[PDB]
Design an enzyme around this catalytic site. Sequence first.
Site, PDB file in Angstrom:
ATOM      1  N   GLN A 109       0.791  -1.235   0.000  1.00  0.00           N
ATOM      2  CA  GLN A 109       0.000   0.000   0.000  1.00  0.00           C
ATOM      3  C   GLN A 109       0.827   1.291   0.000  1.00  0.00           C
ATOM      4  OE1 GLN A 109      -2.181  -1.055   3.732  1.00  0.00           O
ATOM      5  NE2 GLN A 109      -1.736   1.059   4.351  1.00  0.00           N
ATOM      6  N   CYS A 135      -5.452   0.162   3.272  1.00  0.00           N
ATOM      7  CA  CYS A 135      -5.573  -1.207   3.811  1.00  0.00           C
ATOM      8  C   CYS A 135      -6.966  -1.800   3.648  1.00  0.00           C
ATOM      9  CB  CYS A 135      -5.206  -1.219   5.292  1.00  0.00           C
ATOM     10  SG  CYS A 135      -6.254  -0.123   6.330  1.00  0.00           S
ATOM     11  N   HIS A 153      -6.985  -0.984  11.390  1.00  0.00           N
ATOM     12  CA  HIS A 153      -6.239  -1.478  10.250  1.00  0.00           C
ATOM     13  C   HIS A 153      -6.989  -2.644   9.622  1.00  0.00           C
ATOM     14  CE1 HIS A 153      -2.835  -2.215   7.678  1.00  0.00           C
ATOM     15  NE2 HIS A 153      -2.693  -3.446   8.135  1.00  0.00           N
ATOM     16  N   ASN A 191      -1.736  -9.288   4.964  1.00  0.00           N
ATOM     17  CA  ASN A 191      -1.576  -7.845   5.088  1.00  0.00           C
ATOM     18  C   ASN A 191      -1.315  -7.228   3.695  1.00  0.00           C
ATOM     19  OD1 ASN A 191      -1.416  -5.381   6.455  1.00  0.00           O
ATOM     20  ND2 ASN A 191       0.496  -5.850   7.512  1.00  0.00           N
TER      21      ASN A 191
HETATM   22  C1  LIG Z   1      11.836  -6.665  12.992  1.00  0.00           C
HETATM   23  N1  LIG Z   1      12.105  -6.692  11.498  1.00  0.00           N
HETATM   24  C2  LIG Z   1      12.886  -5.485  10.994  1.00  0.00           C
HETATM   25  C3  LIG Z   1      13.358  -5.771   9.560  1.00  0.00           C
HETATM   26  N2  LIG Z   1      12.163  -6.042   8.673  1.00  0.00           N
HETATM   27  C4  LIG Z   1      12.542  -6.300   7.235  1.00  0.00           C
HETATM   28  C5  LIG Z   1      11.352  -6.392   6.295  1.00  0.00           C
HETATM   29  C6  LIG Z   1      10.556  -5.083   6.257  1.00  0.00           C
HETATM   30  O1  LIG Z   1       9.624  -4.995   7.336  1.00  0.00           O
HETATM   31  C7  LIG Z   1       8.553  -4.144   7.209  1.00  0.00           C
HETATM   32  C8  LIG Z   1       7.664  -4.213   6.137  1.00  0.00           C
HETATM   33  C9  LIG Z   1       6.585  -3.333   6.045  1.00  0.00           C
HETATM   34  C10 LIG Z   1       6.331  -2.358   7.026  1.00  0.00           C
HETATM   35  C11 LIG Z   1       5.191  -1.427   6.880  1.00  0.00           C
HETATM   36  C12 LIG Z   1       4.631  -0.681   7.917  1.00  0.00           C
HETATM   37  C13 LIG Z   1       3.570   0.179   7.645  1.00  0.00           C
HETATM   38  C14 LIG Z   1       3.084   0.298   6.346  1.00  0.00           C
HETATM   39  C15 LIG Z   1       3.693  -0.460   5.359  1.00  0.00           C
HETATM   40  C16 LIG Z   1       3.266  -0.434   3.997  1.00  0.00           C
HETATM   41  N3  LIG Z   1       2.970  -0.517   2.881  1.00  0.00           N
HETATM   42  N4  LIG Z   1       4.728  -1.301   5.605  1.00  0.00           N
HETATM   43  C17 LIG Z   1       7.230  -2.289   8.106  1.00  0.00           C
HETATM   44  C18 LIG Z   1       8.335  -3.178   8.223  1.00  0.00           C
HETATM   45  C19 LIG Z   1       9.256  -3.031   9.420  1.00  0.00           C
HETATM   46  F1  LIG Z   1       8.813  -2.158  10.355  1.00  0.00           F
HETATM   47  F2  LIG Z   1       9.509  -4.154  10.137  1.00  0.00           F
HETATM   48  F3  LIG Z   1      10.475  -2.558   9.090  1.00  0.00           F
HETATM   49  C20 LIG Z   1      11.231  -7.106   9.223  1.00  0.00           C
HETATM   50  C21 LIG Z   1      10.842  -6.761  10.665  1.00  0.00           C
END
Ligand SMILES: CN1CCN(CCCOc2ccc(-c3cccc(C#N)n3)cc2C(F)(F)F)CC1
EC number: 3.4.22.27
Length: 217
Positions: free
Chosen positions: A19, A25, A164, A184
Amino acid sequence: LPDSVDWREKGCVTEVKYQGSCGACWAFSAVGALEAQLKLKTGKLVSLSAQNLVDCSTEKYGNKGCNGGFMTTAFQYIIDNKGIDSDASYPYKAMDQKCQYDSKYRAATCSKYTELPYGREDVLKEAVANKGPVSVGVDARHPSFFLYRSGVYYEPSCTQNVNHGVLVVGYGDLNGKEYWLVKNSWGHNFGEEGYIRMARNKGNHCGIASFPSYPEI
Ligand SMILES: CN1CCN(CCCOc2ccc(-c3cccc(C#N)n3)cc2C(F)(F)F)CC1
């Protein structure tokens, strides 16, 4: 009812969407539920246009585009409009735009929707098993939800106040720990490659059974 269900095994769930900075969402949740019903009815799995909802299911439906909205009123727009376009014809731009719906690109219809009773995880289980994926609201306003990587998600500060929109595509248990399988719209890197397994039969945890709904074609 079966002990576990996964609608991805039944060819009824499209790829995970992203998104971005647009709070769509609810649109992604709504289209995801309809996509399953479309497959069940026609044999075709097709991503439907969340952008169509963002741009067209607007003020008249109580929705605010990239600032949020409701899956139920999205379904009613599709009913009133007599159609929704394919994602391919009306792709996602992560912004509010003028309505560009054209019936020449219709990919699905909706005839009705059903809202499940508040907080009843057993009624939710039955609908997931027998009807299809179910649109739900969750309380996703906690850092733990953002940082989720794997396993069954449980946040003790979670409330039943939902903010959400997501999609329940199944349920099961991880070594006895019961979960809902949630799609999601935060891209393929969130959680378990787009999915979060959320605590089930833990007192309507994070409001997952607070506001469930599903459409019919
Ligand atoms: C604890 N880990 C840190 C590294 N992470 C690596 C993968 C990336 O992780 C994520 C993926 C999407 C989101 C996120 C949050 C709000 C809106 C949207 C939209 N559209 N995407 C946040 C994270 C995040 F907050 F986690 F970064 C996985 C989680």
